[PDB]
Amino acid sequence: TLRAAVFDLDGVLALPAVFGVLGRTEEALALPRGLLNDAFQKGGPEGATTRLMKGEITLSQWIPLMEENCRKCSETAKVCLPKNFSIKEIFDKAISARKINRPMLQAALMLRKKGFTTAILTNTWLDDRAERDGLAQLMCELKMHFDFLIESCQVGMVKPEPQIYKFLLDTLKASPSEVVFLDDIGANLKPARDLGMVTILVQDTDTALKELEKVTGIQLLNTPAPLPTSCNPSDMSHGYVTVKPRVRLHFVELGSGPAVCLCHGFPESWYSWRYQIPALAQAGYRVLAMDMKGYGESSAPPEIEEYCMEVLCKEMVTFLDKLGLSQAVFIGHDWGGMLVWYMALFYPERVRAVASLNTPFIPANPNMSPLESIKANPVFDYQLYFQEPGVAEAELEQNLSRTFKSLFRASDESVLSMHKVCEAGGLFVNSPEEPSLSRMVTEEEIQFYVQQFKKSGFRGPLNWYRNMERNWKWACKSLGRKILIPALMVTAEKDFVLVPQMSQHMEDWIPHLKRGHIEDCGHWTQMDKPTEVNQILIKWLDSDARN
Amino acid sequence: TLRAAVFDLDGVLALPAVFGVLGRTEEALALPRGLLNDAFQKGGPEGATTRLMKGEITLSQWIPLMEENCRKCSETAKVCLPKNFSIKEIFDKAISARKINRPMLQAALMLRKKGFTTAILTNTWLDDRAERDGLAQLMCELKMHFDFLIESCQVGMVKPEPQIYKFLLDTLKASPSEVVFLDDIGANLKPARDLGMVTILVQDTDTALKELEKVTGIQLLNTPAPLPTSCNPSDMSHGYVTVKPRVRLHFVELGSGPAVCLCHGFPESWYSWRYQIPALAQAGYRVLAMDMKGYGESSAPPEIEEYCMEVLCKEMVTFLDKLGLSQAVFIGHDWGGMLVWYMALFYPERVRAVASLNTPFIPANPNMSPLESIKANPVFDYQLYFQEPGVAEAELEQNLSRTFKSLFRASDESVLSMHKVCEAGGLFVNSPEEPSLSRMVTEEEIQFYVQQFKKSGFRGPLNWYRNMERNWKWACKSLGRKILIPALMVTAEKDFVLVPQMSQHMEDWIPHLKRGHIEDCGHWTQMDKPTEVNQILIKWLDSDARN
Ligand SMILES: O=C1COc2ccc(Cl)cc2N1
Ligand SMILES: O=C1COc2ccc(Cl)cc2N1
């Protein structure tokens, strides 16, 4: 029985193959057939290319040797090469043109998801070209999805030498009959077959995947649309900044480029952005996913006033100051979305662009107390239940697993009616003791939230709701302002609390506002519809937030 | 007696003043004198500018109101404005032209260094212009050097209103007679004087500083060249990455832009880069200053082999993978400099550029054992003493304060002869029990190193020297390669171990190598000559490593 899958890089996990460019250059330049492919393999195991593939020399050192071989080949075939011909130019274009073969990667992901050990086995070089970063980025994206990456130039062994295959089996800790090996070069496939490994000669992806499905007994082709890459908490870079004596902010950091600061809602975590973090970083941004004050590994002081918008915003500005960031794009959801609109209103010089999921921007009413305003809308009754210190803490902290299982549910699975919460006497009064697991979350993801909330509980998080008057007085100072920096409002069709309709007057205050809308999406936007969230954010970031 | 100094921003800490541009535009456009300055102050306390300065409206909202006032002013003076005239263009250029007044900042730094509480008090606006980042960067650089920053648009009060002065005194927790106030606008200086504050009308900086010196009794003018900004450990962003089960790497992070990974030597810390971190970040780079494996808050496993170059380099590649960085520029010193040359040789695709302080690149000799090579040079005797497990640990761990005080010394202060260390029986055998404090370090900086080394001691750090054979075998695999990515070699005239002369053949292997050289500089390069290190690195980074 198979339990390991090995993939080549060129012509298998990445397309078009670099080998095919030598043939394509011959055809485009009307050179004798196989002239370039011949100079490429010149000397065989003792030639320049084998030395390159074993790591003896670098790609930049190999370029002049390939050039000499091209001259030697043209001399024998009694032909000439053009006076503008460049091996460097040919390879720069070929490497840049080569992209990940998405259905092949999806097949490897599916096999690993079922318990397979996956590995990339590749004949590659030490790239010291001025444009080497492109290949580095490609290898970085691919490698994270595999258990092992074995590169010829690093191991000093090359395909088809039999030692690289014995090395492969040793790293896999598996016998050959347990291994599937996919390669586009038949000669490189031969030693694996000789050892008794299942082999697949890859020409077109579709046929290779049909062969792969048949031999593994796992559906890999025509399979449903997969979820974006998630985060494993133990594999992230964790950052810690002291914003003041008793307050430290924790964040997870991934990627390079313009800083994008992700701000979660209630009662969440940096982990609520698990599907956005790898996508945004891959898109060319430096992601900073916060544990907001009161949550996870960030400090949770008990005082109500430590959680008013004015102090929370001041602390986020201090956070940028301590990291040495003059700006960041601010993206928020729920309470994080409210924070992000206030960052834009009070600190525009520090906000590259602002985006909110679900939370609209509604200017404070100076002629009405914030308490009356909340009372006017039946769906905001849960906010009134949250006012009395200790009451919601007790119910929310009683059973953490039940708390997150009851709250985190999709539109068609709801267990909590947020109207008449005070009258009923709690959020979970007509809720089961052992709620069913939502389709949006695994049991493991629920337990992460459970473990995070074991540290500080719900006091700090509930305090975000306990500053209605303080926030209202501060917000009233901004009533003459308009938001004129780049802004995105993302509405969720089925969020019955933060309804899309509540955002309808936003262009009165944000005239240049851009919009996104997600159908069949509840309140937990990021995990309800991750693919569409990622699509909307990446499109808006690339157009309005730079790169 | 004075104990507080307050500085205005425009015309005081930053020059040329924005006010002077209104007058300059009038002269350049041959408009009636004071026409623009008149439209600017139109309406006085009820006018558009006061609303802007109090935070009622943003700068982008103010621009059309200033334009209308310019029209109203030209109508009264019976003149016309050009058909290309733009308030936005005038202010964009003025703000961009305004830079920190370096001698004024140096005076504030000196006063704060002597125990003064310092503050910036400024009439400013909420900047939402597309080019607002420039001003944000300027405010970021300035604010870090002061105890308080009070901005009119944030406090809703403006100079010369008397409430902003009472607010200033309340934040300072000081009586007026204890306060010096520097302003370039006499009217704004008046209420401070009325309260009994010492005031200085700033026209030219030099005269203002002579007045400041006279009144404080502290030398501020003609003073020696100050050291670059250092780091306060508790004010940094601290990052943590697990590179494998028992190994976590700690780093300090500051700034935005291309990633610059700083790699210290033996027996050091991320803190050895304290003078480079703020300079490199201010220069437009994202700095990652490592605690190398075996040091500070990074893991320190006991096994010798955990510290061979091959594993250390693999872990640094994993560190970039986990942070989502396809590349970083690698800058190393001593053991860090050796690590950085091997990163360039084995992982060029991940190395944007490479720089070494003191450590030259010398290819391994395949015809001689590394032990014989070390024996051939008398200055490398300390390396032989470091070979036996437990011996150097005992001497180095016996008294930490004595250890760092004896090692960290400038060229003219040395207490340790590194020849005949084994024969003598240790590094500190002819060394005092209570060494004098070097001019390079404060007692506080020594105690930071003492506290860091209390965690793991010297076993992990000493193990970097215990892999001579392993490193030699690995290095021999790279003997056919050349370093062809951008490289900088920085030599220190007076380092008697890593002598400048040992780097003389480096262009045989790094043909495009760039160089830096520091005279009257010992082994502890970064702290011996921080100003010159910063100058050399920033110049090479800007020319060869991007931005
Ligand atoms: O379904 C929803 C929508 O709005 C909400 C708002 C707040 C909280 Cl705590 C939960 C939900 N759940
Ligand atoms: O003065 C010096 C120069 O070289 C050195 C090399 C290693 C160590 Cl641990 C100390 C020093 N000190």
Tab-separated table of C-alpha atoms in Angstrom, chain A residues 55-58 60-61 125-128 130 132-133 136-137 140 143 153-154 234-242 251 253-256 286 317 321-327 345-353 477 480-482 484-486, chain B residues 55-58 60-61 125-128 130 132-133 136-137 140 143 153-154 234-242 251 253-256 286 317 321-327 345-353 477 480-482 484-486:
chain	number	residue	atom	x	y	z
A	55	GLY	CA	26.300	22.131	-6.982
A	56	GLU	CA	30.007	22.228	-8.026
A	57	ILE	CA	29.441	25.527	-9.814
A	58	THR	CA	26.723	28.219	-9.824
A	60	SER	CA	26.292	32.422	-13.411
A	61	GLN	CA	29.532	30.385	-13.726
A	125	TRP	CA	21.106	24.692	-9.654
A	126	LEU	CA	22.553	27.359	-7.307
A	127	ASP	CA	20.929	30.496	-8.711
A	128	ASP	CA	23.124	33.650	-8.329
A	130	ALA	CA	20.552	39.236	-10.572
A	132	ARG	CA	17.188	34.873	-8.840
A	133	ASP	CA	14.441	36.191	-6.485
A	136	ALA	CA	13.293	31.817	-4.833
A	137	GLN	CA	9.674	33.070	-4.491
A	140	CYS	CA	9.091	29.237	-1.327
A	143	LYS	CA	8.038	23.902	-0.604
A	153	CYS	CA	22.752	20.970	-6.078
A	154	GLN	CA	22.336	20.686	-2.285
A	234	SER	CA	3.474	26.812	15.849
A	235	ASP	CA	4.939	27.547	12.351
A	236	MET	CA	4.310	31.327	12.452
A	237	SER	CA	6.673	34.185	13.417
A	238	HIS	CA	5.260	35.614	16.691
A	239	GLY	CA	5.915	39.291	17.501
A	240	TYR	CA	5.604	41.153	20.848
A	241	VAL	CA	5.604	44.934	21.413
A	242	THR	CA	5.213	46.804	24.713
A	251	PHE	CA	0.906	39.624	16.448
A	253	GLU	CA	3.901	38.173	10.931
A	254	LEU	CA	4.253	36.802	7.407
A	255	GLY	CA	5.494	38.156	4.123
A	256	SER	CA	7.289	41.196	2.674
A	286	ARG	CA	3.808	42.081	4.917
A	317	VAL	CA	-0.220	54.169	16.726
A	321	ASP	CA	6.009	53.651	16.250
A	322	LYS	CA	7.842	50.813	18.079
A	323	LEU	CA	8.010	48.633	14.928
A	324	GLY	CA	9.375	51.621	12.922
A	325	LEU	CA	6.397	51.736	10.547
A	326	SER	CA	5.290	55.177	9.348
A	327	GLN	CA	2.087	53.580	7.954
A	345	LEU	CA	-10.490	59.554	11.091
A	346	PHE	CA	-7.952	60.428	13.804
A	347	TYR	CA	-4.618	59.178	12.417
A	348	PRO	CA	-4.850	59.435	8.546
A	349	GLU	CA	-1.085	60.013	8.177
A	350	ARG	CA	-0.473	56.532	9.685
A	351	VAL	CA	-3.155	54.743	7.617
A	352	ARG	CA	-2.037	53.760	4.084
A	353	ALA	CA	-5.645	52.620	3.290
A	477	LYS	CA	-14.945	65.537	17.755
A	480	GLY	CA	-16.767	67.758	10.586
A	481	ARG	CA	-14.219	65.378	8.981
A	482	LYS	CA	-14.501	63.149	5.933
A	484	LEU	CA	-10.503	60.836	2.061
A	485	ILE	CA	-7.738	58.171	2.130
A	486	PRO	CA	-8.419	54.903	0.100
B	55	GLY	CA	-8.732	68.962	14.160
B	56	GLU	CA	-12.321	69.895	13.116
B	57	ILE	CA	-11.448	69.277	9.476
B	58	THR	CA	-8.623	67.524	7.584
B	60	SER	CA	-7.680	67.785	2.129
B	61	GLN	CA	-10.966	69.421	3.258
B	125	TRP	CA	-3.208	69.285	10.990
B	126	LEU	CA	-4.741	65.867	10.164
B	127	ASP	CA	-2.858	64.996	6.979
B	128	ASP	CA	-4.934	62.871	4.513
B	130	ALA	CA	-1.922	61.130	-1.032
B	132	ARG	CA	1.073	62.265	3.774
B	133	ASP	CA	3.650	59.474	4.402
B	136	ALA	CA	4.447	60.778	8.968
B	137	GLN	CA	8.072	59.582	8.510
B	140	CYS	CA	8.193	59.385	13.510
B	143	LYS	CA	8.936	62.014	18.266
B	153	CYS	CA	-5.336	68.794	15.947
B	154	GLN	CA	-5.279	65.944	18.500
B	234	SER	CA	12.114	47.007	26.310
B	235	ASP	CA	11.007	49.396	23.483
B	236	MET	CA	11.792	46.985	20.608
B	237	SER	CA	9.482	44.587	18.713
B	238	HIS	CA	10.655	41.061	19.686
B	239	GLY	CA	10.095	38.209	17.203
B	240	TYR	CA	10.183	34.411	17.779
B	241	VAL	CA	10.302	31.662	15.126
B	242	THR	CA	10.475	27.891	15.673
B	251	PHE	CA	15.188	38.616	16.759
B	253	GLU	CA	12.644	44.003	14.305
B	254	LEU	CA	12.552	47.644	13.231
B	255	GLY	CA	11.676	49.476	10.063
B	256	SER	CA	10.158	48.853	6.618
B	286	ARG	CA	13.458	46.381	7.587
B	317	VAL	CA	16.935	29.487	5.510
B	321	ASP	CA	10.758	30.460	5.068
B	322	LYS	CA	8.641	30.821	8.253
B	323	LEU	CA	8.663	34.652	8.063
B	324	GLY	CA	7.621	34.482	4.360
B	325	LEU	CA	10.804	36.159	3.106
B	326	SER	CA	12.168	34.964	-0.242
B	327	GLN	CA	15.409	36.897	0.471
B	345	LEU	CA	27.904	30.211	-1.224
B	346	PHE	CA	25.173	27.644	-0.509
B	347	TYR	CA	21.926	29.653	-0.659
B	348	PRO	CA	22.519	32.551	-3.178
B	349	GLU	CA	18.833	32.660	-4.201
B	350	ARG	CA	17.931	33.614	-0.589
B	351	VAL	CA	20.707	36.221	-0.178
B	352	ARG	CA	19.871	39.667	-1.634
B	353	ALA	CA	23.482	40.829	-0.883
B	477	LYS	CA	32.000	21.090	-1.534
B	480	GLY	CA	34.562	25.334	-7.457
B	481	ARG	CA	32.067	28.168	-6.772
B	482	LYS	CA	32.524	31.927	-6.822
B	484	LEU	CA	28.795	36.580	-7.691
B	485	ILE	CA	25.918	38.273	-5.790
B	486	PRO	CA	26.633	41.840	-4.366
